[PDB]
């Protein structure tokens, strides 16, 4: 009975680990830049490399791993994951670190498909939803607590110790899995149908554009706060914690408002995001200005996320799985797209302009957002 609750809790902690690793390079960019004598912007590629790999490869991986989803696949994953983190610990060239990130990406690609599927199969019927809420909470604890813990463990002991501590969480959980996995062992034909419905494909587009805006600025926030506002390294840590809390507030704001205003919430939130990206550099002349702007930014992108999610949910009630898969796929597509353009703008123009540049896709989203929310006003309840 409480056994099953533990198996869900362990899949959730594994989600925590996989997302803290997926996020924390933002918090470690400058330490990594120093430690290889290069610009923080070029590491943005490690941000891009992982995300685009995860997106494009999760489908062929989840495809080739389709036969044995037994704890064998989990253990194989966790072995590959802890190994990659261990290689990041000992990286002697940025090229090495990028390779290690690629390994984390393969692990995450297979982990996510398998873990989504597995959290339910190991829990009772009423916990079929609560189990979802658990591993989701893990990912929340990932961006809310996980990124700032990783960044402070880097401030103390090197980002090598950051990645090391993460692999260590992975190891104790691989053990837990071996000692709790129950030896436990295809909706892809849906895929062309979704590719046909214009509403769903247009939500996919709107996501890609807004997320490219957001990650164009966010990917390089730590190097921004230090190198351009001139502020401390601890202050960057405060901002990452603050973004987490604002995501908590955006969740409760969204949960309070309800889905009647979902389209509205989102479109207005995209407006907020444009404001934040426009006002990013001006808010640097003072510390408290960037603090306000972080609260607003975090609430905004949280509400945008929850809204796009609800929209893909309502636009494909027949294939919730494949749509959320395509969803995280195009989402990581945008994560890497934003990091890549942020890299390009940091390298060729000043990094001080990322916020300004970022507003350009955001605006597009906003306009498009308004348009498409006029046209398919469909939601959940």
Residue 169 Cβ vs ligand BNG, minimum distance, rounded to whole Å: 16
- Residue number, nearest CB to ligand BNG: 328
Start-end of H helices in 187-319 = 191-196, 198-218, 221-227, 233-257, 262-278, 287-315
Tokens 């849906």 sit on residue: 190
* 43 or 51: CB nearest ligand BNG: 51
Residue 275 Cβ vs ligand BNG, minimum distance, rounded to whole Å: 26
* 55 or 181: CB nearest ligand BNG: 55
Residue 101 Cβ vs ligand BNG, minimum distance, rounded to whole Å: 13
Residue 186 Cβ vs ligand BNG, minimum distance, rounded to whole Å: 11
Angstrom distance (rounded) from CA 244 to CA 242: 5
Reference 14, options 97, 87, 118, 96; nearest CA is 118
Residue 111 Cβ vs ligand BNG, minimum distance, rounded to whole Å: 9
Residues in the chain: 381
| Residues in the chain whose C lies over 2.5 Å from the next residue's N (breaks after) | 185
How many angstroms separate the Cα of 26 from the Cα of each of 34, 125, 328?
A: 14, 38, 19
Angstrom distance (rounded) from CA 333 to CA 335: 6
* 113 or 155: CB nearest ligand BNG: 113
* 59 or 99: CB nearest ligand BNG: 59
Site residues, ligand BNG (CB under 6 A): 19, 22, 54-55, 58-59, 112, 139, 322, 325-326, 328-329, 332
Q: Report the Cα 352 to chain-centroid distance in Å.
A: 24
* 143 or 366: CB nearest ligand BNG: 143
- Note whether 73 and 114 are within 8 A (CB): yes
Residue 233 Cβ vs ligand BNG, minimum distance, rounded to whole Å: 26
Reference 373, options 329, 315, 332; nearest CA is 315
* 74 or 279: CB nearest ligand BNG: 74
């Amino acid at each position: 009975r409480k056994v099953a609750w533990l198996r869900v809790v362990t899949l959730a902690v594994a989600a925590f680990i996989f997302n803290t690793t997926e996020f924390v390079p933002v918090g470690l960019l400058s330490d990594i830049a120093q430690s290889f004598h290069m610009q923080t912007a070029q590491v943005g590629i490690m941000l891009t490399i992982y995300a685009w790999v995860v997106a494009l490869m999760s489908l062929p991986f989840m495809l080739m791993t389709s036969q044995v989803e037994r704890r064998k696949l989990l253990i194989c994953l966790f072995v590959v994951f802890i190994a990659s983190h261990v290689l990041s610990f000992l990286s002697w060239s940025f090229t090495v670190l990028v390779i290690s990130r690629i390994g984390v990406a393969f692990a995450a690609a297979i982990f996510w498909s398998i873990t989504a599927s597995l959290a339910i199969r190991m829990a009772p019927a009423g916990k079929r939803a609560q189990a979802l809420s658990l591993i989701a909470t893990g990912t929340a604890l990932a961006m809310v607590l996980g990124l700032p813990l990783g960044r402070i463990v880097g401030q103390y002991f090197g980002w090598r110790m950051t990645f090391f501590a993460i692999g260590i969480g992975a190891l104790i959980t691989l053990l837990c899995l071996i000692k709790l996995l129950p030896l436990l062992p295809g909706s892809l034909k849906s895929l062309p149908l979704l590719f046909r419905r214009p509403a769903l494909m247009s939500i996919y587009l709107l996501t890609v554009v807004v997320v490219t805006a957001h990650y164009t600025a966010y990917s390089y926030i730590e190097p921004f706060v230090q190198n351009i506002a001139g502020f401390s390294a601890n202050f960057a840590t405060a901002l990452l914690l603050l973004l987490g809390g604002a995501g908590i507030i955006g969740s409760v704001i969204f949960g309070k408002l309800g889905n009647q205003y979902a389209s509205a919430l989102v479109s207005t939130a995209i407006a907020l995001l444009l404001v934040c990206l426009a006002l990013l550099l001006p808010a640097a002349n003072s510390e408290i200005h960037l603090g306000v702007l972080s609260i607003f930014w975090g609430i905004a992108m949280m509400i945008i996320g929850l809204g796009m999610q609800v929209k893909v949910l309502a636009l494909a009630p027949d294939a919730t799985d494949v749509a959320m898969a395509l969803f995280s796929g195009i989402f990581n597509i945008g994560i890497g797209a934003g990091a890549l353009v942020g890299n390009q703008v940091s390298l060729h123009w000043s990094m001080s302009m990322i916020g300004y540049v970022g507003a350009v896709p955001a605006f597009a989203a906003l306009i498009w957002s308004i348009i498409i929310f006029r046209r398919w006003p469909v939601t959940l309840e």
